[PDB]
Ligand binder design. Structure first.
Ligand SMILES: Cc1cc(C)nc(Nc2ccc(N)cc2)n1
Ligand SMILES: [Cl-]
Ligand SMILES: [Cl-]
Length: 182
C-alpha cells in the first residue's frame, strides 16, 4: 500500500520510498550531516555524554548543553527541542533512548511538520546506552514513518535519513527495508 523499491544511490547508502517520503540509511558519523533536524538519543536527564550523545553534545557545543539542562529542570519532558549549536541543522530534538522508539519517531515527525521542515537525520535510537535490540529498533522507526504516511500527515517532510554508527546495525536496517519493499 505504501512501499517502493530498495536501491543504492551512492556507495553505502540505501533508500526506498514510503508514500511520498524518501527513507534512507547509511553508516557514518551523524555530526557531519546537514538536515533541518538532527535527533540525539540520550538519557531521561538530557545530559548523557556517551556514544552518539557524546559526539552530538561535543560538536553542538556548550550553549546546547546548557539549554538541555535548563529545560530538563523546568518540567518532566518525554523529549526536548534546542537550537542546533555548531551542528549543520536548525534544531536538535533530544529523545530518551530507553523510551518506545515508535512513539519517539512519531513525535519527531509531528514537530518537523509544525516547523514546515523537509529533512530529518536520526541515529539508531536506543541501540547505545539503552541497549534495545537493533531488529526491534529498525521495525519501530520504519513503522512510525508508515503510520505518519497512512494518516495523510506528510506535507512538508520529504526525507528521513538514519545515519548508523556500526555497519552491523546498518545490515539489520537494510534487511528490514527488503522485507517491506513493493
Ligand atoms: C554511537 C556513536 C556515534 C558517534 C558519532 N560517535 C560515537 N563515539 C564517539 C567517539 C569519540 C568521540 N569524541 C565522540 C563520540 N559513538
Ligand atoms: Cl541509546
Ligand atoms: Cl547509531
Amino acid at each position: 500500500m505504501f512501499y517502493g523499491t530498495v536501491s543504492s544511490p551512492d556507495s553505502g547508502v540505501y533508500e526506498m520510498k514510503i508514500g511520498s517520503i524518501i527513507f534512507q540509511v547509511a553508516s557514518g558519523d551523524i555530526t557531519k550531516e546537514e538536515a533541518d533536524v538532527i535527533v540525539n538519543s540520550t538519557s531521561n536527564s538530557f545530559n548523557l555524554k556517551a556514544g552518539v550523545s557524546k559526539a552530538i553534545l561535543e560538536c553542538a557545543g556548550q550553549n546546547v548543553e546548557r539549554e538541555c539542562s535548563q529545560q530538563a529542570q523546568q518540567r518532566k519532558n518525554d523529549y526536548i527541542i534546542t537550537g542546533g549549536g555548531f551542528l549543520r541543522c536548525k534544531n536538535i530534538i533530544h529523545v530518551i533512548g530507553g523510551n518506545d522508539v515508535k512513539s519517539s519517531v512519531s513525535s519527531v515527525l509531528q514537530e518537523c511538520e509544525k516547523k514546515n521542515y523537509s529533512s530529518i537525520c536520526l541515529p539508531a535510537i536506543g541501540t547505545g546506552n539503552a541497549k534495545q535490540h537493533p531488529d526491534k529498533v529498525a521495525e519501530a522507526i520504519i513503522d512510525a514513518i508508515e503510520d505518519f504516511v497512512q494518516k495523510g500527515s506528510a506535507q512538508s517532510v520529504k526525507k528521513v535519513k538514519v545515519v548508523i554508527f556500526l555497519p552491523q546495525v546498518l545490515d539489520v536496517f537494510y534487511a528490514n527495508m527488503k522485507k517491506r519493499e513493493g
